[PDB]
Design an enzyme around this catalytic site. Structure first.
Site, PDB file in Angstrom:
ATOM      1  N   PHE A 131      81.466  13.483  47.562  1.00  0.00           N
ATOM      2  CA  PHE A 131      82.831  14.278  47.674  1.00  0.00           C
ATOM      3  C   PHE A 131      83.106  14.681  46.225  1.00  0.00           C
ATOM      4  O   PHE A 131      83.035  15.848  46.043  1.00  0.00           O
ATOM      5  CB  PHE A 131      83.990  13.369  48.146  1.00  0.00           C
ATOM      6  N   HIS A 181      94.701  22.291  46.007  1.00  0.00           N
ATOM      7  CA  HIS A 181      94.357  22.010  44.515  1.00  0.00           C
ATOM      8  C   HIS A 181      94.251  23.135  43.835  1.00  0.00           C
ATOM      9  O   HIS A 181      93.583  24.043  44.340  1.00  0.00           O
ATOM     10  CB  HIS A 181      93.407  20.760  44.378  1.00  0.00           C
ATOM     11  N   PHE A 215      89.121  16.735  38.837  1.00  0.00           N
ATOM     12  CA  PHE A 215      87.706  16.299  39.602  1.00  0.00           C
ATOM     13  C   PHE A 215      86.948  17.420  39.534  1.00  0.00           C
ATOM     14  O   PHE A 215      86.813  18.469  39.350  1.00  0.00           O
ATOM     15  CB  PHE A 215      88.097  15.847  41.010  1.00  0.00           C
TER      16      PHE A 215
END
Ligand SMILES: Nc1ccc2cn[nH]c2c1
Length: 164
Positions: A59, A125, A112
């Site tokens: 992920f 995002h 991230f």
């Protein structure tokens, strides 16, 4: 051109190497500028010494909470939070750099790096760059994650800054 910045990352006190990121200031200048300045620490605070606190295999690897080190904190160079600039860049595959958030218009400093295509985050995002070099380091970080996000090693950004 677009800024190039770096993160030097330790795992349990030993260096994994360097992740180099291109920040797409051409598309998201406000989001890129925040990340750039947090890398240099020029505003008096930033990523130096902070951790990857949430890492989920297949992920993403999440970091940037330099206030609380647990995923609740962080702050931008503009204020505590800032708006979603745009959703023009998409979560197209491994190496995508994107802002973590707590819903619409809650960007701070948490970010991230994707280790897969995360298309469901498109429109939610803000993507603002990608990995130029050091995907090997990202895969190492990823391997120290878990399904819950809890890391099995202490993953620290020991140094960071701007290359160009
Ligand atoms: N900016 C930001 C990013 C992620 C989270 C999670 N909780 N609060 C946050 C704030």
């Amino acid at each position: 051109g677009n800024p190039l910045v770096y993160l030097d990352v330790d795992a349990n006190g030993k260096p994994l190497g360097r992740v180099v990121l291109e920040l797409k200031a051409d598309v998201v200048p406000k989001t890129a500028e925040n990340f750039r300045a947090l890398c240099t620490g020029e505003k008096g605070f930033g990523y130096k010494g902070s951790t990857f606190h949430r890492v989920i295999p297949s992920f993403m690897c999440q970091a940037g909470d330099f206030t609380n080190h647990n995923g609740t904190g962080g702050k931008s160079i503009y204020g505590s939070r800032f708006p979603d600039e745009n959703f023009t860049l998409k979560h197209v595959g491994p190496g995508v750099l994107s802002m973590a958030n707590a819903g619409p218009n809650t960007n701070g400093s948490q970010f991230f790096i994707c280790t897969i295509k995360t298309d469901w985050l498109d429109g939610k995002h803000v993507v603002f760059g990608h990995v130029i070099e050091g995907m090997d380091v990202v895969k190492k970080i990823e391997s120290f994650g878990s399904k819950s996000g809890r890391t099995s090693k202490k993953i620290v950004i020991t140094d960071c800054g701007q290359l160009s």
